Structure formats: C-alpha cells, structure tokens
Amino acid sequence: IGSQWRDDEVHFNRTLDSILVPRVVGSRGHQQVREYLVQSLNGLGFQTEVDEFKQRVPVFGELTFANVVGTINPQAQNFLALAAHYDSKYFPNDPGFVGATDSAVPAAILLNTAKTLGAYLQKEFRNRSDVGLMLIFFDGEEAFKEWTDADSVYGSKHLAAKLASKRSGSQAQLAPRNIDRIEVLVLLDLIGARNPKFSSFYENTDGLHSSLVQIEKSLRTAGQLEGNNNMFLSRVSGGLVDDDHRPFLDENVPVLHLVATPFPDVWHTPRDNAANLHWPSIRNFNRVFRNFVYQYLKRHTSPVNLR
Ligand SMILES: *[C@@H]1O[C@H](CO)[C@@H](O[C@@H]2O[C@H](CO)[C@@H](O[C@@H]3O[C@H](CO[C@H]4O[C@H](CO)[C@@H](O)[C@H](O[C@H]5O[C@H](CO)[C@@H](O)[C@H](O)[C@@H]5O)[C@@H]4O)[C@@H](O)[C@H](O[C@H]4O[C@H](CO)[C@@H](O)[C@H](O)[C@@H]4O[C@H]4O[C@H](CO)[C@@H](O)[C@H](O)[C@@H]4O)[C@@H]3O)[C@H](O)[C@H]2NC(C)=O)[C@H](O)[C@H]1NC(C)=O
Ligand SMILES: COc1ccc(NC(=S)NCCCn2ccnc2)cc1OC
Numbered sequence: 001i002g003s004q005w006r007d008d009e010v011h012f013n014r015t016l017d018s019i020l021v022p023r024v025v026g027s028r029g030h031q032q033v034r035e036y037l038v039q040s041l042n043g044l045g046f047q048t049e050v051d052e053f054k055q056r057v058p059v060f061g062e063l064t065f066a067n068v069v070g071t072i073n074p075q076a077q078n079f080l081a082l083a084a085h086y087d088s089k090y091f092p093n094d095p096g097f098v099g100a101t102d103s104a105v106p107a108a109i110l111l112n113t114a115k116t117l118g119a120y121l122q123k124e125f126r127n128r129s130d131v132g133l134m135l136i137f138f139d140g141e142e143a144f145k146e147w148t149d150a151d152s153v154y155g156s157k158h159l160a161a162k163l164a165s166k167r168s169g170s171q172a173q174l175a176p177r178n179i180d181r182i183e184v185l186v187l188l189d190l191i192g193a194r195n196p197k198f199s200s201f202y203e204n205t206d207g208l209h210s211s212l213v214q215i216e217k218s219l220r221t222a223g224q225l226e227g228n229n230n231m232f233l234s235r236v237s238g239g240l241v242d243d244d245h246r247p248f249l250d251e252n253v254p255v256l257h258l259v260a261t262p263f264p265d266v267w268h269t270p271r272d273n274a275a276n277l278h279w280p281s282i283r284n285f286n287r288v289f290r291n292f293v294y295q296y297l298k299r300h301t302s303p304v305n306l307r
C-alpha cells in the first residue's frame with residue numbers, strides 16, 4: 001500500500017553524518033563529501049560522472065568545482081532528474097557551518113531514496129529505455145561574497161551549459177539537446193526543519209505538485225505519517241526563490257522547486273546544524289517523496305512534456 005516502500009533510517013542517518021561536515025568549495029571537507037558522493041552513487045548502482053572545472057570567484061580566486069551526477073539507464077530517451085547542492089556556505093565568522101538543511105539533508109534524502117527504492121531500481125527499472133533516473137549533486141550553489149546573478153549557482157550554470165551544447169552533424173542537429181531530455185528537474189533545498197511548507201512555484205509542474213499533495217493525503221489516511229501538519233500545500237507560492245534551477249529554467253527545463261517557504265528559522269546562521277533538525281518532518285518528507293519518485297517512474301510510458 002503505502003507499505004510497499006519502507007523507511008531505512010539506518011542508511012539515512014549514516015548518509016547524513018557522512019555529508020554533514022564543513023564543505024566550502026576548496027576545503028578538506030568538500031573533497032571528502034565529493035568523494036563520498038561518488039562512492040555512494042556507485043554503490044547504489046548509478047553510472048557516475050563528475051563535471052569538474054576551474055573558475056575564479058570572489059574572495060577565493062580560482063576554485064575547482066565538481067558537479068556529481070549519477071544516472072540509471074543513461075541511454076534512455078528521457079530522464080527524471082532529482083537535485084540538491086552539496087557545497088556549504090562560506091562565513092568568515094562561522095567556519096564550522098554545516099548547512100544541515102542547506103543542503104545536507106536534501107542530499108541525503110536523494111541517496112536514501114535510491115536506497116529505499118533499490119528493489120525497483122536494481123532490476124525492473126533497468127528493463128526499459130523510455131525513462132532514466134538522474135541524481136545531480138550541484139557544486140557551488142552558494143554565493144562567496146553576496147548573492148547575485150553572477151555570484152551564485154556556479155556548478156549549475158556549468159552543468160546546464162554542458163548539457164545544452166550539441167555535437168556536429170545532421171543526426172545531432174536533428175536530435176534533441178541532452179538537456180531537453182530532462183522531463184523535469186526536481187530540486188530539493190532547505191529540508192530538515194520542523195513542519196516545512198512546500199507550495200507550487202510553476203504552473204507547468206503544478207500537476208506534479210498535486211501528486212505530492214495526494215500522496216501525503218493517502219499516507220496520512222493510512223496512518224503512515226507522524227503528526228498532523230500538512231507539508232505539501234495546494235497553494236501557489238509567494239514570490240519565487242532563486243536557486244540552482246535557474247540555469248535550467250533558462251534553457252526551458254521544467255522545474256519542481258521543493259524548497260520550504262518560509263525558510264527554516266536557522267537559515268544561514270550557526271544553528272543550521274543536526275541539533276535543530278526535526279526527524280519526524282524528515283521521515284514524513286521521505287515517505288511522500290520516495291513514493292512520488294516510484295510512481296513517476298512506474299507510470300512513465302510516453303515522453304512527459306511539460307515545456
Ligand atoms: C537517526 O538519528 C536520530 C537523531 O539522532 C535518532 O533520533 C533519536 O531517536 C531516539 C531513539 O528513538 C530518541 O530518543 C527517544 O525518545 C523517546 C521520546 O522522548 C521524548 O518524548 C517522551 C514522551 O513520549 C518524553 O518522555 C521524553 O522526555 C524524557 O526524555 C528526554 C530525553 O533525554 C529528557 O530530556 C526528558 O527530561 C525526559 O526524561 C522526550 O520528550 C523516548 O521514549 C526514548 O526513551 C527510551 O530510552 C530512554 C533512555 O535513553 C529510556 O529511559 C526509555 O526507557 C526508552 O527506552 C525504550 O525501550 C525500553 C526497553 O529497553 C522501554 O523501557 C521503553 O518503553 C522504551 O520503549 C528515547 O529517549 C531521540 O529523541 C531522537 N532524537 C531526535 C533528535 O529526534 C534516530 O533514532 C536515528 N535512527 C536510527 C535508525 O538510528
Ligand atoms: C529567509 O527567507 C528568505 C530569504 C531570501 C529569499 N529570497 C531568495 S531569492 N533567496 C535565495 C536563496 C538561495 N539559497 C538557498 C539556499 N541557500 C541560499 C526568500 C526567503 O524566504 C521566502
């Protein structure tokens with residue numbers, strides 16, 4: 001029922017602990033988490049590629065960025081893409097900042113979703129070529145000096161450009177851009193705090209949002225959620241929130257932006273740590289989300305077009 005796909009909090013908790021370290025681009029911690037993501041994706045049976053590049057940024061000068069991408073069914077026609085950022089924000093006066101909600105927990109949720117749905121993804125899901133699953137760990141989401149158009153979302157700008165560029169020849173020029181084979185980028189951000197609220201930011205992905213609303217109602221009615229707070233609202237968002245999806249949105253990719261609004265109390269303060277996470281909210285999100293991903297992939301037949 002809701003009971004087909006069970007929790008694995010042992011896995012969740014270890015995965016979170018392994019990500020939850022200071023990880024400004026260029027730091028020892030960032031390299032530790034980078035390597036951890038590669039190992040983890042490989043062990044969950046993904047084809048793993050690193051989009052590594054050098055770029056000059058405020059304060060630091062030249063840094064080496066690396067987006068980490070896992071794919072199952074790489075030669076599929078189209079893809080569900082799920083994403084989070086793995087860098088943490090630089091704060092002169094808070095080198096210990098771990099960004100628990102931003103976005104250690106979102107990143108751990110992605111790996112844990114692949115784990116809990118492993119029995120599907122290991123076999124039946126591989127027996128097809130219509131749809132694949134991409135897990136994208138963006139690097140350099142966070143501004144180095146102050147958030148602006150230029151000082152932000154560095155890894156995503158770079159991955160979006162890479163996926164957008166074509167190869168030579170008739171066959172390529174008549175074929176889609178790689179980036180156009182993403183049916184929707186589902187970006188998770190600011191998840192971990194008590195009683196988060198997710199509202200729909202884009203009309204074209206509103207039916208996907210409605211599915212989350214529905215899965216939540218179904219699991220609640222079956223007694224499978226903790227507490228009585230509604231996490232997925234059937235409401236449009238207040239204003240838009242700038243994030244890693246922007247460079248993708250700009251190349252016409254549809255976006256489901258699962259960022260909590262209001263932002264967690266602790267956002268961009270030293271208190272965005274494990275002590276301030278709310279595990280029942282994490283578990284509730286995980287249950288809704290793993291079922292959403294499963295259903296999307298299981299119900300997929302023809303290309304999903306939301307452009
Ligand atoms: C992934 O990581 C997360 C984060 O680290 C882990 O989350 C933690 O999970 C643990 C264990 O499940 C949680 O601790 C447990 O909390 C229970 C609820 O406590 C609160 O509510 C109850 C009301 O229901 C209050 O009574 C409590 O107040 C008292 O305790 C607090 C906490 O120290 C004190 O500050 C207070 O002043 C009170 O004294 C809380 O408000 C709680 O039931 C449970 O208690 C068990 O263990 C204690 C000793 O630690 C025993 O005294 C007690 O007997 C309980 O033992 C169980 O088993 C024995 C049999 O041996 C039976 O006698 C009992 O009936 C009972 O079943 C424990 O404290 C913790 O809160 C939670 N942390 C966070 C931040 O969410 C996940 O577990 C982890 N997941 C995995 C898979 O590893
Ligand atoms: C504190 O509440 C808010 C603060 C700012 C904004 N607006 C924008 S456009 N934010 C860009 C966020 C980029 N990011 C995400 C994670 N780390 C950085 C909205 C907020 O609440 C609705």
Ligand SMILES: [Zn+2]
Pocket residue numbers: 089102142268
């Ligand atoms: Zn942030």
